[PDB]
Amino acid sequence: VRLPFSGFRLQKVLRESARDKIIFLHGKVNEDAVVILEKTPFQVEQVAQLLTGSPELQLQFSNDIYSTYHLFPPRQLNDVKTTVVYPATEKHLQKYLRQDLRLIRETGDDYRNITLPHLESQSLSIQWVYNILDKKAEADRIVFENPDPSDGFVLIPDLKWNQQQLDDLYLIAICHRRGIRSLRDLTPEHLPLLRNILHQGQEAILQRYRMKGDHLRVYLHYLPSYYHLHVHFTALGFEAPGSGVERAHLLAEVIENLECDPRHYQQRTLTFALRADDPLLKLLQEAQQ
Amino acid sequence: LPFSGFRLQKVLRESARDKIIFLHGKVNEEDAVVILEKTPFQVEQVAQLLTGSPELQLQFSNDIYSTYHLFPPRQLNDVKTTVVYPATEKHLQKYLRQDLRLIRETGDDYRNITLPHLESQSLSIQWVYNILDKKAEADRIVFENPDPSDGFVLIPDLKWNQQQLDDLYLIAICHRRGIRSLRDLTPEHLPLLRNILHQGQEAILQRYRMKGDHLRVYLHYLPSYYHLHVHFTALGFEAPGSGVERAHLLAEVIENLECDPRHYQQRTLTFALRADDPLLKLLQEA
């Protein structure tokens, strides 16, 4: 009947997805509440009966054999799944919050003059990466390894993939070689490594999980989440966060770019998104005005 | 509706993630496809509802967590409904759920396998020509450069109900005829591509107040229809075919052509095909 509090005043949309028809709202009450609203899937019988029984339809437009409408269905199709977290702690607000993103186009020179110095101004640990590579941690999770210290890598499932089905298959290849921070460091010297990751990684997944290479999206992030070269292997059906064109770069194309254009990744402009509160965004914007 | 008496033949496709359903029905007893999609939330109106007397049913509760059924007022329950009628067999197969496989098409694969296979088909883009010729949707045009060679029409895509900016989605359709896809692009088309990118973004800034750094602007390969068009989408929208395996950023298409005139004839392109697509077999064979 009633929500477990009084007087909802919106502070912030923590996250919204128009694709998934879901929104996460931070509201002030009286104290903090999170309310999550999600539209519901259609039930076939409910739609089929609506379409034969006086539906309230209103034209947005038509063109040839196509027409689009606003439909206002009866109550049974209008359920909205509503999840209330109250009181919400700062941890709740942080787990749901996603910053709005802005696109930047970074020239080779912007990288050299602005981005790289900004990265060098930070002290970020990747010791967790080295512990895996050195077999001190997570050795039991490695699915495949090419042990070569120059051209080798380990393949490990993503932590959030429960390995309970192939629909959301997701593994990460991490190279043994140290000091390759991102796409920007890649030269023809790295072709053997990159080929190994692509071919051996796909083969390992075929053997272990019986998933063929043409069912795999294999790509790198730019900007990456940590600055030691790593490659994502996801089921093609799994539209994983970070597989968008504004972040993802297909390993096969990275290889072919290096093969025909050796300085590609030092010379060409790369496009990525930054959180609107990221100080790097302001630096690149200031440098580009 | 453009017909009477929808009799369900088949659920062609459904998604619980996207809250969408595709139905094949018999009408006027003719085939029709009807597509129903739940709409994005109206944030301020939802917040207004929550602070009032929303109609709720408690499904379960455990200390700080509770789950409800909310039944909003009529104005918040809009379902975007798209009708394809009369629907051909191509339409019925197109919307059928199907498994996708990736393929890497070399420049020679395209010329010797894909293009002949395309050229062999007879596909209608009458809706596209109706927009360009002002026979349909003329009132909906957001921006036009009418130059027959380097010009285009910018128009909200069918996908977008225009009711919120979170899923902002327009298409630029070039006036020039016979540019089928990426594969046809050469430096000849650079003025057109530049016009689309810069005039398209300026139009969106003026109309919607959305800056270029809030947009993801890209082409599809393979395209769903073979007349060059560009997708202008909110960066925050997980937009159709915006994945790396389909989307090509317009700015990069332009720069690729500037660096290598034959880029899109010579280079290998990667894209997904449906398992039941005969092109997939033809390419795998070759």
Ligand SMILES: Nc1nc(N)c2c(OCC3CCN(Cc4cccc(Cl)c4Cl)CC3)cccc2n1
């Ligand atoms: N303004 C405007 N925009 C448009 N896009 C129009 C329009 O677009 C038809 C395509 C038809 C196919 N697919 C994509 C598609 C292909 C295959 C399977 C699926 Cl599941 C889908 Cl989703 C989007 C729509 C038609 C008529 C008028 C239009 N008018």
